[PDB]
Amino acid sequence: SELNEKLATAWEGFTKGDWQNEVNVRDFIQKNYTPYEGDESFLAGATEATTTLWDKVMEGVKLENRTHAPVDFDTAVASTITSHDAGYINKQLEKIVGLQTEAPLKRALIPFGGIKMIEGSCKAYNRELDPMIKKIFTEYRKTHNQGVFDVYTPDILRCRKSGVLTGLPDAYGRGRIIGDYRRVALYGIDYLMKDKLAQFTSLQADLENGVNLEQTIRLREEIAEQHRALGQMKEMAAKYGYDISGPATNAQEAIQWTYFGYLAAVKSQNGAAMSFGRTSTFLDVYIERDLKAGKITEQEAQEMVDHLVMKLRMVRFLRTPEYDELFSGDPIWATESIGGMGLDGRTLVTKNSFRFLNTLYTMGPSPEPNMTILWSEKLPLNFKKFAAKVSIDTSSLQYENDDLMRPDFNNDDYAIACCVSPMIVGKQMQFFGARANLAKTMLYAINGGVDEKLKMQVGPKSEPIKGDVLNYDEVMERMDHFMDWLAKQYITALNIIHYMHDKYSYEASLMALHDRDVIRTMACGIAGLSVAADSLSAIKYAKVKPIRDEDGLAIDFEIEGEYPQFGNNDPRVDDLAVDLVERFMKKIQKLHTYRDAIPTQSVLTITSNVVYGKKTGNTPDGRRAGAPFGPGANPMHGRDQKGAVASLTSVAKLPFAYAKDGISYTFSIVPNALGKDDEVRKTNLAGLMDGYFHHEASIEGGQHLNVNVMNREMLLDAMENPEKYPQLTIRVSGYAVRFNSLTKEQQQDVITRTFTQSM
């Protein structure tokens, strides 16, 4: 029972546990992390090197926002883990190193997903794609894109064109995968390759015995690619002069090793969301040891965390203008899950929790990393306040219900991927599915499947409603039959998509940091919940007159009589939204899926609320054609007028039990609505979230909360004078973005949203 001399030395001082004999990051954390209930008084400030480096990087960020385009990007190199040479901002000042390419902010080419998108980007930003790269990825190496469109049905193609099913991961990396990068810091590459070889070998029997033949062969090949990827991780780090074959011996190496794990991912896959995971607490274990041993000062600790978070502020991907409108603001979703409570009762909050939030002060506000606080009523009051303070000062944080998710998973080591989709680190991933247009599904029910904007048969050919006034019973009967159809097309599209993504763009380096068998879910999204819900409320509580055209196609409606709206704590309308979520979830649930991915749902839109709303005509709720839907599960623009408590209670009523993939809610409130001074504001904000996230056996509670503390006038001033608010950040749909990174139309969406004036 003699532990490898490398392991024993690096792990000097660490408490014993199963984690020393097998891969178990959760156990290591449990046996070693030091819970912290104190306040922010220990926090240090930015060093000269940190500011020098960040300011230099801000110069490129300003250029990006100004030109709404990449600073620079590859034109002739196919990116892989080992493709690029080491790149630095300033080699002499960086405590933590690693960039995607050889230059800061220079975007790369990830061709495995598709060559057409690369061409489109090259055309849009005025650059020329190397002819050789093009030839390779059209004639030799088949891409994810081409595989999907070779199998797609003309039905799906129609839904893609009309705006019923658009923006699905058929033209960009699927993402939604979080490799446990902490594994690299803990065990070192070598130990992980030896573990993978074991996993590979454990499948030999089943193979020789014909047990699930094709599934076995596939898994063996995937594990083989995972093994090869881990080796390239070493080669990559080696370019920076590092040897990560063995475990991290100190704090700087734990941070560096963990980042190197992530760096490999963002160098090989261009997923929509490339999240970081739950690492702040984990890294604290190494920082604490170094402080206690007097090998690192508190300021040097911040500097390290700063340089890491700074790299996370520098992750970039070459995207198309089409992608830019579906996912606005140049988002990365390098999500970090901070805090939370353990299963045993103690808080997972640590000094590093504060250090991470402190990056907002040391380097100013920033959209990335997407810092998420795993909220719990049992959290140390000290942390609850500091978190709120940071939200008040920067509007860069988001909150998710730990009291709900922890018990559900019965695990204290789960992380948030992208915006609100939870997963147990290294043991579970998602099959990203974007979102479907539920609003348009209603209009299709009323119009017999013909697109109210394109006048073409998209949905199944059925007779449109002949009525003179809309009847709730009649309309819903069709809405159901159309939702069945929407569910089938949506699942079929995702099945094709993920079959092709596993084939042409298997995320080898991320799956290499996962267990042998990973739990998979078929994440389906719903867009325009409120538009659909309110439209139903205007038919069961008022008089709607369908203004038809020379074919009987309802292109507009007349409204007489005040009708209920989602976001006012009124059960009559709120009960309809909760019903819709349930209906769709029960529908997709009965369909067969690729790799048996358990279908889940999410009320999330991103900037699809703008794109879909743009392609959707006049709706029964009074919304005009071309107008944006509400971001995520939000009530339609301005409709929630009974203050915070009211709008928070409506969104909390939404069943997370039917939307396991998440329920996004962007909440904006004026400084004065929270109090007269900061102390009152912090206390009240924390109190709001305590009431919102309040979990009990008969009360589920809210799942997500974006917090913006600002005034509409400040943003109006930001639109006129961009150069005055360089680091201004806002929560927009489950993630953050610099205000100056949005287009005039995307900003228009923001400013016209609900700004809570009271409580």
Q: Which part of the chain contacts a second copy (CB under 8 A), choosing from 57-65, 588-596, 643-651, 732-740?
A: 588-596
Least Cα distance to 525 among 700, 336, 660 occurs for 660
Q: In the bound complex, what is the minimum distance in angstroms from residue 489's beta carbon to a second copy?
A: 8
Q: CB under 5 to 8 A by kind: which of a second copy, Cl ion, Na ion, none does 207 bind?
A: a second copy
Q: Please give the biggest Cα pair distance in the chain.
A: 85
Give the Cα separation of 639 and 349 in Å (integer).
Answer: 37
E strands, 86-229, are 106-109
Give yes or no for residue 592 binding a second copy (CB under 8 A). yes
Under the binding rule (CB under 8 A), the answer on residue 214 touching a second copy is yes
Please state the closest distance from residue 153 (CB atom) to a second copy, in A. 5
Q: Which residues touch 407 (CB under 8 Å, ≥6 apart)? A: 695
Q: Give counts: helices (H), strands (E), the chain.
A: 29, 18
Nearer to a second copy, 52 or 146 (CB): 146
Cα–Cα distance measured from residue 143 to residue 135, given in angstroms and rounded to the nearest whole number: 12
Which secondary-structure segment (H or E) carries 376? none
132 binds, among Cl ion, a second copy, Na ion, none (CB under 5 to 8 A by kind): a second copy
> Residue from 14, 88, 361, 499 that binds a second copy (CB under 8 A)?
499
From 151-159, 167-175, 548-556, 565-573, span contacting a second copy (CB under 8 A): 151-159
Q: Which of 49, 58, 238, 591 binds a second copy (CB under 8 A)?
A: 591
Binding mask 651-670 for Na ion (x = CB under 5 A): -----x--------------
Secondary structure class of 399 (helix, strand, coil): strand
Cα dist from 74 to 197, 609, 705, whole Å: 35, 32, 37
Question: Of the candidates 568, 574, 582, which has an alpha carbon nearest to the alpha carbon of residue 656?
Answer: 582
Please name the residue that has the structure tokens 């610099």.
738
The yes or no reply on residue 208 touching a second copy (CB under 8 A) is: yes
Contact 363, 49 (CB under 8 A): no
Decide if residue 224 touches a second copy (CB under 8 A).
yes
- Smallest distance from Cl ion to CB 245, Å: 17
- 140 near a second copy, rule: CB under 8 A: yes
At 17 the three-state DSSP class reads coil
358 neighbors 328 (Cβ within 8 angstroms) = no
Q: Is 75 in the site for a second copy (CB under 8 A)?
A: no
Lookup result for tokens 């991961």 = 169
Query: Cis peptide leading into 599, omega within 30 of 0?
Result: no
Token code pair at residue 697 = 């056996």
Please tell me the count of residues contacting a second copy according to CB under 8 A: 36
Handedness of CA 106, 111, 114, 115 (dihedral sign): positive
Using rule CB under 8 A, residue 680 touches a second copy: no
* 3-state class (DSSP) for residue 416: strand
Tell me if 521 contacts a second copy by CB under 8 A. Answer: no
Looking at the Cβ atoms of 516 and 694, the one nearer to Na ion is: 694
Helix (H, G, I), strand (E, B) or coil at 281: helix
Taking contact as CB under 8 A, which single stretch among the options 249-257, 495-503, 709-717, 730-738 is the one that binds a second copy? 495-503
Q: Is 586 in the site for a second copy (CB under 8 A)?
A: no
Q: How far is the CB of 732 from Na ion (least distance, A)?
A: 21
DSSP letter (8 states) at residue 296: S
Beta bridge partners of 557: 546
Q: Choose the binding region for a second copy from 1-9, 130-138, 369-377, 447-455 (rule: CB under 8 A).
A: 130-138
Bridge pairing between strands 106-109 and 336-339: unpaired
Any contact of residue 594 with a second copy (CB under 8 A)? yes
* Closer residue to a second copy, CB minimum distance, 132 or 598: 132
Give the burial class of 139: count Cβ atoms within 10 A of its Cβ; 0-12 exposed, 13-18 middle, 19 or more buried.
Answer: exposed
Token pair 């590979």 in the structure block, residue: 200
Of positions 8, 198, 217, 547, contacts a second copy by CB under 8 A: 217
**Annotated catalytic residue within 122, 159, 418, 524:** 418
Letters for 8-27 (x = contact with a second copy by CB under 8 A, - = none) are --------------------
Among 280, 391, 495, 535, which residue interacts with a second copy (rule: CB under 8 A)?
495
Closer to a second copy at the Cβ: 58 or 136? 136
95 versus 220: smaller Cβ distance to a second copy:
220
418 is catalytic: yes
Residue 549 binds which entry of Na ion, Cl ion, a second copy, none, with Cβ cut-offs from 5 to 8 Å by kind? none
Cα separation of 732 and 736, whole Å?
6
Which x/- pattern, by CB under 5 A, does the window 677-706 give for Na ion?
A: -----------------------x------
Q: Which is nearer to Cl ion, 182 or 227 (CB)?
A: 227
Q: Which residues bind Cl ion (CB under 5 A)?
A: 200, 224, 227
For the chain, the first-to-last Cα distance in angstroms comes to: 62
Cβ atoms 88, 94 nearer than 8 A: yes
The Cβ-side half-sphere exposure at 703, using a 13 Å CA radius, reads 29
Quick one: what does residue 137 bind among Cl ion, a second copy, Na ion, none, with the CB cut-off 5 to 8 Å set by partner type?
Answer: a second copy
Give the other-Cβ count within 10 Å of 114's Cβ. 27
Nearer to Na ion, 515 or 570 (CB): 570
Contact 730, 712 (CB under 8 A): no
Residue 213 site contact among a second copy, Cl ion, Na ion, none (CB < 5 to 8 Å, cut-off depends on kind):
a second copy
The listed partner (a second copy, Cl ion, Na ion, none) that binds 756, CB under 5 to 8 Å by sort, is none
Q: In this complex, which beta carbon is closest to Na ion, that of residue 408 or of residue 700?
A: 700
The pairing of beta strand 421-424 with beta strand 428-431: unpaired
76 interacts with a second copy by CB under 8 A: no
The residues near 48 (Cβ < 8 Å, ≥ 6 apart) are: none
* Interface region with a second copy, contact rule CB under 8 A, candidates 208-216, 266-274, 307-315, 691-699: 208-216
Sign for the pseudo-dihedral over CA of 396, 401, 407, 408:
negative
Return the one option of a second copy, Na ion, Cl ion, none that residue 139 interacts with (CB less than 5 to 8 A, by type).
a second copy
> Which of 63, 71, 93, 207 is the binder for a second copy (CB under 8 A)?
207
- The entry of Cl ion, Na ion, a second copy, none that residue 214 binds, CB within 5 to 8 Å by partner kind: a second copy
Residue 80 vs 754, nearer CB to a second copy: 80
CA angle 99, 100, 102 (to 5 degrees): 70
H/E stretch holding 556 reads: strand 554-560
Amino acid at 230: L
In the list a second copy, Na ion, Cl ion, none, the entry touching 492 (Cβ below 5 to 8 angstroms by class) is a second copy
Distance CA 526, CA 483 (A): 11
The contact set with a second copy (CB under 8 A) reads 78, 80, 111, 132, 136-137, 139-141, 147, 150-151, 153, 155, 204, 207-208, 210, 213-214, 217, 220-221, 224-225, 488-489, 492, 495-496, 499, 503, 591-594
The contact set with Na ion (CB under 5 A) reads 656, 700
Which residues are annotated as catalytic? 418-419
